[PDB]
Design a protein around this ligand. Structure first.
Ligand SMILES: *O[C@@H](C(=O)NCCC(=O)NCCSC(C)=O)C(C)(C)COP(=O)(O)OP(=O)(O)OC[C@H]1O[C@@H](n2cnc3c(N)ncnc32)[C@H](O)[C@@H]1OP(=O)(O)O
Ligand SMILES: CC(=O)SCCNC(=O)CCNC(=O)[C@H](O)C(C)(C)COP(=O)(O)OP(=O)(O)OC[C@H]1O[C@@H](n2cnc3c(N)ncnc32)[C@H](O)[C@@H]1OP(=O)(O)O
Lengths: 163, 164
């Protein structure tokens, strides 16, 4: 049984491990490995401090998924946030990304953001299917935005706007 | 009265910060509403020069009256990509100077080895849009309500060029 809850400092080390494992698959995230443990700590505690939406899915006191919205710094952009998420392989395709994504959205809307945006590889059909089901709209395509193994991948930009 | 375009040097930092501050403070075109503090701008200009990232100034009577620059993406999967920004003092607009600054700046980006140059523009900035179209940027999509300037939402257009 999986519990979804706000990330705490207690979770950082296990989160680093989930992130690193998803990055290492090299077909979903913009990173190829997690950032070092120490960068990931500063960031998580930065997020915690500022009350930015950041949820982990926990099974057996281990983080098996995460979903977060980072608010933009820049004053003209501070009504917007950027979503990122990921789930360990065993836990995918069983409705958990939907649940995680609803918690995080509800917290971003509570926080007072107007606009949530994401970027997804054009070949990531399961991520795209989830985002469409949730209500994100396609806003365009960045040609050759990502280079992973000597290969260029497009990224689809998508967005949702709170009513 | 002659404008010259050249790579930015350490001495341009203060003139450049004033240019950036004048154009930002108009609050219609740029995504920052004010320049970053001078010493913040100096750090960023020293770094660009040192790491060879394309950054050009237009110079008239010793002053920086315009700039165009390309910031390289940090992450390893996005490092073949650069983000373009540019601005010109009001008296020097609409005279072909942005087109010249862009040409020089894109050519240096291509020489450096970048594949993809990307930009965001306000949907209502018709002059910047027309110049980007003319130079050969493609539209890549429209971000709804992506910009808020003083309680008003603006769409942003994403555009990009790919070097062949
Ligand atoms: O005008 C310059 C500028 O600095 N404006 C203020 C700051 C700014 O917008 N920064 C860039 C956008 S920040 C962002 C998020 O994008 C810029 C926009 C830099 C252009 O430089 P120049 O004005 O020197 O451009 P120039 O090379 O003369 O070419 C202009 C081009 O556009 C046509 N044109 C001018 N004005 C308009 C309007 N209002 N509507 C449609 N088209 C316009 C001129 O006719 C030129 O096009 P061609 O005829 O040559 O096609
Ligand atoms: C840059 C980015 O946004 S990518 C960040 C996204 N992260 C990743 O891609 C990392 C790895 N993948 C994952 O972590 C997860 O698969 C997520 C986060 C993308 C999606 O979460 P999950 O829990 O798998 O999704 P969930 O079960 O809620 O829903 C998935 C949907 O995809 C459908 N689907 C699954 N695989 C495919 C496929 N290959 N083709 C088309 N549709 C698919 C499912 O049927 C379901 O839609 P439905 O309920 O309409 O039938």
């Amino acid at each position: 049984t999986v519990t979804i809850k706000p990330i705490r400092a207690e979770h950082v080390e296990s989160f680093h491990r989930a992130l690193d494992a998803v990055s290492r698959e090299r077909k979903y995230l913009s990173f190829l490995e997690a950032p070092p443990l120490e960068a990931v700590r500063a960031f998580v505690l930065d997020m915690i401090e500022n009350d930015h939406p950041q949820f982990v899915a926990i099974a057996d006191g281990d983080v098996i998924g995460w979903c977060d919205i980072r608010r933009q710094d820049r004053a003209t952009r501070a009504h917007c946030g950027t979503l990122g998420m990921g789930i360990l392989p065993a836990y995918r395709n069983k409705g958990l990304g939907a649940r995680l994504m609803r918690r995080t959205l509800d917290a971003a809307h509570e926080f007072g953001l107007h606009r949530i945006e994401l970027s997804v590889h054009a070949d990531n059909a399961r991520a795209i299917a989830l985002y469409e089901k949730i209500g994100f709209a396609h806003e365009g395509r960045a040609r050759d935005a990502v280079s992973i193994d000597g290969h260029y991948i497009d990224s689809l930009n998508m967005a949702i706007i709170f009513g």
